[PDB]
Amino acid sequence: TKPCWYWDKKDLAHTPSQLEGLDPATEARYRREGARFIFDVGTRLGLHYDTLATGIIYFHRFYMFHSFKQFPRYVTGACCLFLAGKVEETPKKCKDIIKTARSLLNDVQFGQFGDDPKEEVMVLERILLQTIKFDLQVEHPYQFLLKYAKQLKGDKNKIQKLVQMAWTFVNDSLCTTLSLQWEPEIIAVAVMYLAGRLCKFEIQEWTSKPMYRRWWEQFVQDVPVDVLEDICHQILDLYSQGKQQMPH
Amino acid sequence: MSYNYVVTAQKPTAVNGCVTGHFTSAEDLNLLIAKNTRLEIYVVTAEGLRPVKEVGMYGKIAVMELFRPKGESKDLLFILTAKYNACILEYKQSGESIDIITRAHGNVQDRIGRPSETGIIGIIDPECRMIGLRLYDGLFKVIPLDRDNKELKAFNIRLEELHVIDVKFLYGCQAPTICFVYQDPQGRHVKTYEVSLREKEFNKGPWKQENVEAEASMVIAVPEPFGGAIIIGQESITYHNGDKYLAIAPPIIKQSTIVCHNRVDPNGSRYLLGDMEGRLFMLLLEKEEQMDGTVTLKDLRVELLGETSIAECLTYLDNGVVFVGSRLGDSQLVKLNVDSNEQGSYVVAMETFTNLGPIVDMCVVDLERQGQGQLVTCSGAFKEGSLRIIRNGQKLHIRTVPLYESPRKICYQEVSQCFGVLSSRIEVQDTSGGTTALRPSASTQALSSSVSSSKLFSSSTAPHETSFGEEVEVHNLLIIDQHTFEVLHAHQFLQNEYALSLVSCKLGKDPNTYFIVGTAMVYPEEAEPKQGRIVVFQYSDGKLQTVAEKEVKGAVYSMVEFNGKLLASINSTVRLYEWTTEKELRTECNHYNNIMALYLKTKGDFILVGDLMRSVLLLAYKPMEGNFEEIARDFNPNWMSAVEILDDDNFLGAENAFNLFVCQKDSAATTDEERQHLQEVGLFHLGEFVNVFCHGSLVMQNLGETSTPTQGSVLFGTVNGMIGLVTSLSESWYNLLLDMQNRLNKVIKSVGKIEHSFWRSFHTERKTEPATGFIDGDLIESFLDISRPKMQEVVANLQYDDGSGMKREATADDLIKVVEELTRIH
Amino acid sequence: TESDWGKRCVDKFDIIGIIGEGTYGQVYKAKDKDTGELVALKKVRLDNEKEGFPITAIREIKILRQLIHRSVVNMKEIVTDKQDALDFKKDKGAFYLVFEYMDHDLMGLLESGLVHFSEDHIKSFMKQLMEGLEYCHKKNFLHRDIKCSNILLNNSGQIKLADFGLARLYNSEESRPYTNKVITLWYRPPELLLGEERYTPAIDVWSCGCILGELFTKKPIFQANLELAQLELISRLCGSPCPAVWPDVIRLPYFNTMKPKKQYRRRLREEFSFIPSAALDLLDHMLTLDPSKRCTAEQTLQSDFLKDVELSKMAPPDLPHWQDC
Ligand SMILES: CC[C@H](CO)Nc1nc(NCc2ccc(OCCO)cc2)c2ncn(C(C)C)c2n1
């Protein structure tokens, strides 16, 4: 019926990119760049946050089936965003995405688009659709972060701080392979869990069951803490590696 | 775009209705006969009828009634067309000049309504206060007959009884009263209402509802001496009037369904009744006068008088003369005698009026080698079935070959100097367990005969119970000589086998010429036939010999020879068979994208397929590959009745709504999709139901005929006997004739003031479109009949195009020559 | 696996013929070589390369893989033309969307005049359509192109909604700018004629009500060629748009611009007096001018007309027979 779009961390050692001699750090960097490119291009175009995420998810899934050495990331990214716009009903013309991509990319980077940027992108749409197995509907942590937050009752300022901090963590998780490891529902919980620890908030008190120390089990069933910690660790690692610090 | 021309070669002959009254003068008794779109007016004489006037209306005549409102010297005529155009007409004569006056007119169509099952019904009050119309289920429309209602404005009264069978205005009521039979889940009932023009609604009726026969068909309004109504059914006749109820159930009427009634005696003592087998009965109202001075109905009696043609309408004239208006056979004038003849009959035929009847099929064949061509038509049904040989000679010469059974298909085989004709006769289950024919007919009077011995369906194991009295069809192939038209041979097909298709041709390398018949096994239980036979016959030395049989899984609706191969349509499938050296049919290629492949036509390696509901598909045989290819389809949905190929690009179709359309290949190779789309370029409401298209022309060809502007010749036969002709035009000739039509329509006065453009507009219950690509030749040919002042008025400011002179002014004499040349194509 | 769409080739289907022309491509009837199941194949051509894969097809793929209902057409898979080897750029072959073949479409049955609908037949039909619409409306998807041609019917009496090319999600909390002119004029609601642009799911209801009346009359209720003429026809039957019946009508862009000849009174019950009372009440509510007062899909299912209809008894309609030829 529907395809499986989630892998185990150990499996990422065997992507086409890895097996063509690309080392783990480089593929990670290539993904951070492609994601941040999709995010920046669409943000310049004024695109909804779901549209950016959908393009990023297409992008991440794509390179589970292909190698970065044979498919330029910035072309793939532009193609993903182009399709995402049509899927999420926030369409953009391919020429405008190229225009924005050129504004944001240097001369070396834009060389990936070759002599005819639009053609390279439009041609790729065929492979993208076949690669993502025409499974176009994608759910994102954002909707669950809001759906679950709406069930919290308490100080508006204390919660709203939780939501925004978690929202920032969601935007940051788009540069990682978490989208390929855990369903969006778990991600939304993980970012709520992380923000709570950082803000020293005890979320259970706001839940309908205030003695249920496992506050997430009422939103997402069958999630061990280890999963949430694994997700938190990866998100925090991104901040430790970068010069940026936790939003707080 | 495509340009075509359509003319009538023979006007409709079937009688759709007939009434008697004082229409032309308050003194003379007139018989008005209605044929589809044609009104014939006669004056009754002691010998017969004197014709006085014939008008054509731009509409199909559905209602025709004569009424005389207080203050009028003579009867007025009400007519309602099937397109809901209503009008009141008056006959006016000034010396030698006869004209028909339109006193009132309008369109009574409702925006929202469901057309009734039993069709449009129109009745007029005995006091001529209002016209009752039953157009839609659950609604009764009233046109009040006031002097000021020149537009025939009307209102609807809500009617609780949704399924009405028949309704009539009653005599002898204090207020306008309607008596009608209706059907609901509990059976059929008779009920009455009063119509109040002041309140514009129904009031309680004079007498209560009564439960009536399940198949109560007709309501007869009895006149003032008796009052009340008579209800005719299948087995019983009943009289109703308040507390009075009489019912007679003679066994004779049960045998055949009674379809038409008329009043002989103005007081209501005697009524005439006719049934589908042609028997004519006299219904007698036996009077009993009480000492009170009042008159009551004592009893009802039915007496058989004799046999007439199957009659759509009967009307008593005077003396013993009755006009038998027949839609399935020839109409008649018959005299009723007081004394029976030596055979026991009181009916003796006086005159016979030719009715080409339903033209199920026809072929054009040159019997005398003159090059003129003759049209042999399968005409009539049941006892009226006949073969009609028609030739041009200024009137058409028609010869009739009586068959006394229903003819279905005809095809000519020159090698054998004979015709092959498919026919069916009605037999009835009898006490022997078999069936007995009601009368001898062509299939039983053949010189030599044969009965099918095929064992293909012999295994059966499917029970089909038979009840005594039930009807069955028995199908035959008739071999008929082309000179004597004598039935030489008749082959009876299997029990429950219907013959649907017939061809005469040679196949493959076989030098023998065969009759080939496609059949279907028809059982009442099945929705669609699932068994069938393709049979190859050889007529040799006075005997028909079966050469081969091919079993199919469906009905062989249509067959046509295809370059030495046999092209047959079996239900959805369209199949091509090869004829092997072993004299057996061998399948080659099939096409399945059809719902019901009813009709087939071929030109070269191209095939035109007609579907029950998907219009037409252009197929092609690809010899390099040995299979079919879909060239182009008409995606617009149409119910087909007949199709024909005009040329390699234009295709002609006939709809069940009495419309004609012409499809063409879009001739644009830009996209393959454009080529695959057949664009309807011609739309035209013919007003007739076309069953057969046939290439050919009856006009004699001496090789000297001035080459007419029209090119091509397709004849078609219709259900009402009308024969028409379709031909193509050049763009220049079309524009000239089309511009002329628009000029003629402003000049010519229409009966009922019906707009010509509306009449010819494509019309389905769902859609109405303006006509396109068709020239109404009957309108063009009327230019020669309008007065000289009108002729010159028409030609004013008329310019020519694309000719020897780009722009040229036309004169009335110039057009007289052009139209006269157009009248020479038929 | 069954989920890896876009790879299997169209070779696996034997093409029977072209059953219609679709909006993004032509639609073919085909038979699966492996199973023998009849399918309807819809062709999507990206060769134009103006905007790539058509969004209309993207909508249908996105939505129909989410919607699973007896009265909603199922997309079985997506197959492709033999693609070029090693040359992905050169390949211009188009993909085909696979569906189940339905024996007829309502426009074809009604147009031929061959189909006859009894009350019970109309009950089974409308109940299936409204159940499908309720499922879709509960999922917050709007069809936006309800027409007799988009109702496919199997000879078994099963109804399925079919063309989801214009379908989009509806957000009650966030009003969004939408395509004003979505439904075909004959089935378009009065609100869109006046150009709401922020339409409710009730636009689909109005269309289905128009179908309800067309099944009784066998003729489309409101047939016009111009948007103003349609408002006139609707106004004569349903009443002229006025603030009393449509308080917010004054906010609609074209209310002052597009006026009917008169302020007509409502005549629906009078002109449809032949319709059964249980159904006439459904028509009155479905054909309500004010979208906020127009009944919902669930409400129609909970009507005297359709509530007690049992879907087990499909009661197949009187479909063309051999005798009708
Ligand atoms: C006809 C318009 C609709 C638009 O939707 N066309 C369609 N008609 C399907 N069947 C009905 C049919 C059957 C035979 C036929 O014959 C033509 C010549 O023989 C024509 C139509 C049908 N079945 C599935 N689909 C879609 C959802 C993939 C369909 N779309």
Give the three-class secondary structure for A143: helix
- Which phi and psi angles does A172 have, rounded to 5°? -70, -35
Shared-domain flag, residues B755 and B691: no
Structure tokens at B348: 């003796």
Query: Touch between chain B and chain C (3+ CB pairs, < 8 Å)?
Result: yes
Same domain, B515 and B567: yes
- In this structure, the answer to whether residues B724 and B736 fall within a common structural domain is no
Query: What is the rounded CA–CA span in Å between residue B391 and residue B265?
Result: 43
Q: What is the DSSP letter of C72?
A: B
Atom of ligand 1 minimally distant from the CA of B635: 17
Number of C-beta neighbours around residue B130 at 10 A: 21
User: B550: closest CA among B527, B572, B576, B525?
Assistant: B576
Nearest 5°: phi and psi at A17? -60, -45
Backbone dihedral angles phi then psi of residue B178, each to the nearest 5 degrees: -110, 140
Q: Which of B364, B362, B305, B359 is nearest to B329 (CA)?
A: B359
Identify whether residues A119 and A209 lie together within a single domain.
no
Task: State the CB neighbour count (10 A cutoff) for residue B292.
Answer: 7
Cβ neighbourhood burial of C324 (10 Å; 0-12, 13-18, 19+): middle
Pocket, ligand 1, Cβ cutoff 6 A: B 593-595, 614; C 19-20, 27, 40, 42, 73, 99, 101-102, 104-105, 149-150, 152, 162-163
Q: Which domain holds residue B80?
A: 4-353
Phi, psi at residue A97, to the nearest 5°?
-65, -40
Last residue of a domain, one of A107, A137, A167: A137
CA dist B118 and B121 (Å) reads 8
Residues B670 and B755 in one domain: no
The residue whose CB lies within 8 Å of the most ligand 1 atoms, and thus the one to mutate among C59, C75, C105, C158, is C105
Query: What CATH number is given to the structural domain containing B121?
Result: 2.130.10.10
- DSSP 8-state code for residue B384: G
Return d(Cα B821, Cα B611) in angstroms, integer.
Answer: 37
Residue ending a domain, among B294, B324, B353, is B353
Same domain for A128 and A171, yes or no, is no
CA–CA dist B706, B680 (Å, integer): 32
**List of chain C residues whose C-beta atoms are within 8 Å of the C-beta of residue B138:** 273-274
- A60/C13 Cα distance (integer angstroms): 33
Q: C73 CA to chain A: closest CA distance, Å?
A: 16
- C315 vs B: CB within 8 A: no
Q: Could you tell me if B29 and B49 are in contact, meaning their C-beta atoms sit under 8 angstroms apart?
A: no
Judge if B237 and B317 occupy the same domain.
yes
SS3 C63: helix
C-alpha distance from C62 to closest chain A C-alpha (Å):
6
Structure tokens belonging to residue B423: 């026919």
Going by their DSSP bridges, the two strands B270-275 and B279-289 should be labelled as: antiparallel
- Output the DSSP codes for C278-300: HHHHHHHHHT-SSTTTSPPHHHH
What is the rounded CA–CA span in Å between residue C305 and residue A119?
Answer: 56
Nearest beta carbon to residue C3 from set A3, A89, A130:
A3
Same domain for A131 and A142, yes or no, is no
What does each C-alpha distance from B124 to A80, B76, B141, B214, B755 come to in angstroms?
76, 12, 12, 27, 26
Query: What tokens were used for A216?
Result: 């997430």
d(C-alpha B539, C-alpha B199), whole Å: 74
Query: Distance between CA atoms of B559 and B516, rounded to whole angstroms?
Result: 9
* CATH H-level, domain C10-100: superfamily: Phosphorylase Kinase; domain 1 (3.30.200.20)
Give every CB contact of residue C157 below 8 A, 6+ residues apart in sequence. C121, C124, C314, C315, C316, C317
**Which residues of C have a catalytic role annotated?**
145
What is the distance, to the nearest Å, from the Cα of residue B10 to the centroid of all Cα atoms in its chain?
Answer: 14
Domain co-membership, A55 together with A35: yes
Q: Which of C210, C255, C182 is nearest to C106 (CA)?
A: C210
Confirm if B275 and B257 have CB atoms less than 8 A apart: yes
B287 and B340 within one domain: yes
Instruction: Tell me the C-alpha to C-alpha distance, in Å, between residue C134 and each of B321, B369, C187.
Output: 69, 73, 18
Spatial neighbors of A116 by CB under 8 A, at least 6 apart, are none
**Domain residues for A89?**
1-137
Q: State which of B306, B338, B353 marks the end of a domain.
A: B353
A121 contacts: CB under 8 Å, gap ≥ 6: A75, A78, A79, A82, A94, A97, A98, A113
Distance B693 CA to ligand 1 centre (A): 30
CATH number of the domain where residue A131 is located: 1.10.472.10
Do A5 and A56 fall within a single domain?
yes
Using CA atoms, how far apart are residues B580 and B566, in angstroms rounded to an integer?
11
Whether residues A190 and A221 fall in one domain: yes
Distance, CA of B363 to CA of B698 (rounded, Å) = 11
Instruction: Tell me if B111 and C271 make a contact (CB, 8 A cut-off).
Output: yes
Cα distance between the two ends of chain B: 26
The pair of structure tokens assigned to B333 is 């004038």
Phi/psi for C70 (5° steps) reads -60, -35
Do A74 and A188 belong to one domain? no
Cα end-to-end span (Å), chain A? 43
Q: Does residue B241 contact residue B229 with C-beta atoms inside 8 Å?
A: yes
Q: Position B115: which residue type? A: P
Alpha carbon separation from C273 to B138, B153, C211 (Å, rounded): 7, 20, 17
If asked whether residues A213 and A169 sit together in one domain, one would say yes
DSSP 8-state class, residue B485: -
**Given C3, C61, C91, which is nearest A1 (Cβ)?**
C3
The rounded distance, in Å, linking the Cα atoms of B274 and B261 is 7
Distance CA B27, CA B94 (A): 16
Statement to judge: residues B200 and B320 lie in one domain: yes
- Three-state DSSP class for B548? strand
CA–CA–CA angle A25, A26, A29 (5° rounding): 90
Same domain, A124 and A146: no
How far is the C-alpha of B79 from the C-alpha of B752, rounded, in Å?
8
Asked if residue B757 and residue B617 are part of one domain, the reply reads: no
- Resolution of the structure, angstroms: 3.2
Domain match, B491 and B634 both: yes
Q: How many helices (H) and strands (E) does chain B have?
A: 7, 62
CA distances from B434 to A223, B360, B455 (A): 82, 29, 19
Q: Which residues of A touch C87 (CB under 8 A)?
A: none
Q: Are C297 and C205 in contact (CB under 8 A)?
A: yes
Instruction: Please state, as a whole number, how many other Cβ atoms lie within 10 Å of the Cβ of residue B615.
Output: 26
Q: How far apart are the first and last CA of chain C?
A: 46
Q: Do both B329 and B460 map to the same domain?
A: no
Q: Which of B674, B707, B728 is the last residue of a domain?
A: B728
- Residue B705 has a CB neighbour count (10 Å cut-off) of 11
CB B369 within 8 A of CB B423: no
CA dist A73 to A34, A87, B509, Å? 6, 20, 69
Q: How far is CA C147 from CA B235, B417, B520, B596, in A?
A: 48, 57, 38, 25
CA–CA gap between residue C293 and residue C247 (Å, rounded):
10
Place of tokens 């590696």: A241
Which residue among A113, A137, A161 closes a domain?
A137
Experimental method: X-ray
The hierarchical CATH code for the domain C104-303 is 1.10.510.10
CA dihedral B462, B468, B471, B477 (to 10 degrees): 70
Q: How many helices (H) and strands (E) does chain C have?
A: 9, 10
Domain ranges of chain C: 10-100, 104-303
Q: Which residues contact C294 (CB under 8 A, 6 or more apart)?
A: C202, C205, C206, C285, C286, C287, C288
C26 alpha carbon, distance to own chain's centre = 19
What is the longest distance spanned by two Cα atoms in chain C? 69
With H, G, I as helix, E, B as strand and everything else as coil, classify residue B31: strand
State whether B118 and B228 are in the same domain. Answer: yes
Last residue of a domain, one of A137, A161, A187: A137
- What residues have CB less than 8 Å from B185, skipping those under 6 apart? none
CA B66 vs. chain centroid, Å, equals 24
Residue keyed to tokens 């959908």 = A54
- Minimal-distance CA residue to ligand 1 atom 6: C20
Contact, A126 vs A132, CB < 8 A?
no
Q: Which of B46, B19, B15 is nearest to B30 (CA)?
A: B19
Report the binding-site residues of C for ATP.
19-27, 42, 100-105
Both tokens of B377, joined, read 């038509």
The whole-angstrom separation of Cα B731 and Cα B609 is 28
Residues 6+ apart with CB under 8 A from A242: none
Looking at the fold, whether B778 and B685 belong to one and the same domain comes out as no
Total domains in chain A come to: 2
Sheet strand arrangement including B650-655:
B640-645, B650-655, B659-665, B678-685
Task: Say if the Cβ atoms of A2 and C7 lie within 8 Å.
Answer: no
- Please name the residue of chain C whose CA is at the shortest distance from the CA of residue A90: C55
> What's the CA angle centered on C163, arms C158 and C164, to 5 degrees?
115
For residues A133 and A147, state if they share a domain: no
d(CA C103, CA C156): 9
How far apart, in whole angstroms, are the C-alpha atoms of residue A73 and residue A67?
10
CA B155 / ligand 1 centre spacing (Å): 42
Six token digits for residue A110: 């834009």
Report yes or no: B718 and B688 within 8 Å, Cβ to Cβ: yes
CATH code of the domain in which B807 resides = 1.10.150.910
